[PDB]
UniProtKB/Swiss-Prot annotation, chains A, B:
It is found in: Cytoplasm, Cytosol. This is Nitric oxide synthase, inducible. Polyubiquitinated; mediated by SPSB1, SPSB2 and SPSB4, leading to proteasomal degradation. L-arginine binds at Q181, W290, Y291, E295. The gene is Nos2. Macrophages. (6R)-L-erythro-5,6,7,8-tetrahydrobiopterin binds at S36, R299, I380, W381, F394. Produces nitric oxide (NO) which is a messenger molecule with diverse functions throughout the body. In macrophages, NO mediates tumoricidal and bactericidal actions. Also has nitrosylase activity and mediates cysteine S-nitrosylation of cytoplasmic target proteins such PTGS2/COX2. As component of the iNOS-S100A8/9 transnitrosylase complex involved in the selective inflammatory stimulus-dependent S-nitrosylation of GAPDH implicated in regulation of the GAIT complex activity and probably multiple targets including ANXA5, EZR, MSN and VIM. Zn(2+) binds at C28, C33. Homodimer. Interacts with NHERF1. Interacts with GAPDH. Interacts with S100A8 and S100A9 to form the iNOS-S100A8/9 transnitrosylase complex. Interacts with SPSB1, SPSB2 and SPSB4. Interacts with ELOC and CUL5 in the presence of SPSB1 or SPSB2 or SPSB4. Forms a complex with ASL, ASS1 and HSP90AA1; the complex regulates cell-autonomous L-arginine synthesis and citrulline recycling while channeling extracellular L-arginine to nitric oxide synthesis pathway. Heme b binds at C118, Y409. Signal peptide: none annotated. Belongs to the NOS family. The chain holds residues 77 to 495 of 1144 of the full protein.
């Protein structure tokens, strides 16, 4: 039956039945809870050595095809049954199968719809799908990505999109983007122990250098694309500068803000996740949506492990930077968030504030429970890194489980690659 | 073995072995996660009808006695073995047993030390224990509580303390405080649909009225003590006003802040939890520590389901109160937090800001892993309702499990009481 779920802000009660359709075991044990683990094996889908067993594949394929045709208003049994038969024959004859374009589209949106850590899921149906399942070379990958970045950016009017490269076969010819995001700044560990740029890309940045890339040693040096096609070693490609849209940071009151020399890319695109559907796994499917202010303002700029600009902004605000109890951090981070939002709007780059994001997600979660009696949600990721209880999602109890289709994490390509 | 746990702010890794000592099953399933549930049955310890089975009691009692004597630097096998024998005889002869004062003290501090939702646990060893296991009447309960409130308040220099009433026997003669907190404001649903006071005490407040208490219908009317002794019906007692220390709210810049007419009690004391130790359950053991700013500033004052004063403060700050994306809520809530801290310090009432609290907890969590290879922690409760990622605990992965001794929740007394 259903798990009773409550919203303490409204007192509203919901019944989750959808959690029944969950697959394998999640992160938490029978007597313990590992919900605050960032990368649990339950959310990861690693390497392959041989094809996936027919006994396993077929059952999943049937289920997905059933899910697909099931999502239709006005059924099509005929086509449905015909498709079931066709897929079976294909698995029998080929050892796998191919999704129709419409099923891929459906699958990409469902996997998004089933992403528990995503707060923008109310947009799940508005998604552009670029079919690159035909791709054969890295150069071709590079071309597909450039087309993706260009379409997505749309001169600042960001559009959600995903590019689907070839599915995994024997797992010995994997298409993979060694990048965590299509566009990201490099991090360099200076000779003086210092760190210039984004400390989070330190390892990858060093990899790019090892792959022959030339380090510019700047705080905001966009990293190269490191593409691996058909199991082949990775080839490094520079992204055409004209394609990378950026926003320079400035505050609508503090004119000294510009003097910080801050900026960020406008396109947030996850590059290293794997799409799972009907038995199939796509280890290469970069997708993107648009930014939520706090991602840049709070995390990227203020994380102690990222740009860490919070004390500097505090000093320039003339705050009691040495009195933790003065709440100067609360003050600074809020002004940084205003700079980030204001700067995007000014330059006409689509962005969304955390309050608005939280509010729309609640609307979505309600549609979901009403539509399919549930919505997989990770409270720990869905609550903004600032203003927690000030947002409605904080007061909402939720269930986190892995359905299918789904976007999994993967093991760092350079850790599991036979050069 | 150990569960590897990481802190993404420092990159530091920890090994949790302590989770091994966990008892029953927690909240989360094998394929689902219910970590965001406020009141899971795994954290609740309900009513009793008959004594607790000797087969169950004895094993737990032995374990606790072993834990107790084990916590000693320089062992005392002799006394240890002697105590094991004495407790056994007692269970055999009486059908239960009594803890020595020192074991009760030890047990109250361990149960605190084992509270995953508590951020002040670095103070776990500094706790005053008032032994009221001899109490027989409500009047006596009322006297013990008054003594507790007086000792704890200490004219503003708050001291942590707990009062332990008689343990449960057959569960048909339970000592219980029908209150959620020793000191709390009443909530009244006005005739006009409105709500005056604290909306969170609406039901209880109505109960008090039903028990003959006279409603003053004010925004800050301290509620009466509703004590139930030896299974007897609850008797209502007014708390001596002189004993309830309060702080009037005022901002160190906005002089209009006082015009809001806000104030809060200085003593946060949980009244309705149950202490569990060596097979024994104490359904009545009010305890207290001191406030952390955000509890009042963010939750009590700004929760939409509490006093909900956030838009009013926003208007009086002249903020774009109708433009959610302006981040006015971030601005107001921060000033309210400054009012709350400033007002407590001004009136010399012990209080702690969330930044300082988060920092000390990290120090504690480190002592714990180093001391006993673990620390049960609920990330969802331990992260402040504001400034999330700005605090170190947000970047710390943690394991949540129920050890013993432990402070459990209980079912609302008025739901399970034979009048
Ligand atoms: C259109 C607006 C969108 C917004 C505003 C949005 C917002 C977010 C945010 C705030 C995160 C948190 C990232 C972090 O904290 O590191 C996230 C994660 C995620 N989103 Fe969305 N999202 C959007 C679109 C998408 C799209 C188009 C997809 C996929 C087709 C998607 C899939 C996911 C997944 C899988 C994660 C998890 C990433 C991870 O675990 O690192 N999102 N999203
Ligand atoms: C001395 C300083 C203390 C501080 C600053 C502190 C702080 C906190 C805070 C912030 C909460 C959150 C309450 C909420 O959000 O509703 C909490 C919960 C809790 N604390 Fe502590 N605490 C302190 C002392 C104590 C003491 C003395 C005990 C017990 C002997 C204790 C046991 C617990 C327990 C069981 C909870 C859970 C309450 C619930 O689930 O509603 N704390 N504490
Ligand atoms: C340890 C903890 O799980 C980790 O810091 C999480 C918390 N919540 C988060 N939420 C989002 N959206 N993104 C993150 O990176 C994190 N980090
Ligand atoms: C739904 C969710 O569990 C609930 O709102 C929690 C979140 N974290 C919390 N954390 C603390 N300290 N106190 C609370 O009351 C809550 N409420
Ligand atoms: C990839 C689609 C979802 N994208 C998104 N809203 N942001 C999450 C990734 C960007 C990352 N949080 C950053 O600020 O660097
Ligand atoms: C009871 C000991 C722990 N107390 C404490 N620090 N606060 C939690 C209870 C008070 C509650 N959060 C309130 O602001 O109304
Ligand atoms: Zn869990």
């Amino acid at each position: 039956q259903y798990v009773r779920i409550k919203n303490w802000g409204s007192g509203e009660i919901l019944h989750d039945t959808l959690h029944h359709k969950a697959t394998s075991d999640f992160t938490c044990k029978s007597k313990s809870c590992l919900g605050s683990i960032m990368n649990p094996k339950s959310l990861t889908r690693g390497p392959r050595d041989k094809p996936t067993p027919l006994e396993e594949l077929l059952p999943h394929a049937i289920e997905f095809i059933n899910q697909y045709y099931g999502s239709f208003k006005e059924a099509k049994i005929e086509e449905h049954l015909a498709r079931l038969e066709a897929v079976t024959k294909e698995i029998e004859t080929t050892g796998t199968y191919q999704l129709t374009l419409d099923e891929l589209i459906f699958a990409t949106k469902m996997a998004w719809r089933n992403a528990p850590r995503c707060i923008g899921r109310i947009q799940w149906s508005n998604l552009q799908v670029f079919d690159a399942r035909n791709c054969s070379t890295a150069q071709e990958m590079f071309q597909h990505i450039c087309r993706h970045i260009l379409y997505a950016t749309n001169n600042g009017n960001i559009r959600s999109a995903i590019t689907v490269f070839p599915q995994r076969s024997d797992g010995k010819h994997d298409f993979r983007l060694w990048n965590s995001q299509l566009i990201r700044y490099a991090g360099y560990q200076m000779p003086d122990g210092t760190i210039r740029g984004d400390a989070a890309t330190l390892e990858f940045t060093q990899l790019c250098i090892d792959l022959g890339w030339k380090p510019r040693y700047g705080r905001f040096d966009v990293l190269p694309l490191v593409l691996q096609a058909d199991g082949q070693d990775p080839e490094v490609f520079e992204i055409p500068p004209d394609l990378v849209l950026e926003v320079t940071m400035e505050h609508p009151k503090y004119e000294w803000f510009q003097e910080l020399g801050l900026k960020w890319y406008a396109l947030p695109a996850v590059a290293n996740m794997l799409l799972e559907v009907g038995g199939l796994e796509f280890p290469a499917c970069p997708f993107n949506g648009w930014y939520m202010g706090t991602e840049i303002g709070v995390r990227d700029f203020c994380d102690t492990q990222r740009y860490n600009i919070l004390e500097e902004v505090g000093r320039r605000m003339g705050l009691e930077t040495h009195t933790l109890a003065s709440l100067w951090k609360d003050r600074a981070v809020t002004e940084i968030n205003v700079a980030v939002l204001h700067s995007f709007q000014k330059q006409n780059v689509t962005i969304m504030d955390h309050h608005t994001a939280s509010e729309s997600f609640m609307k979505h979660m309600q549609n979901e429970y009403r539509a399919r009696g549930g919505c997989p949600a990770d409270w720990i990721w869905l609550v903004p890194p600032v203003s927690g209880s000030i947002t409605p999602v904080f007061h909402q109890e939720m269930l986190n489980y892995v359905l299918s289709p789904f976007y999994y994490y993967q093991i760092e390509p350079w850790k599991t690659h036979i050069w």
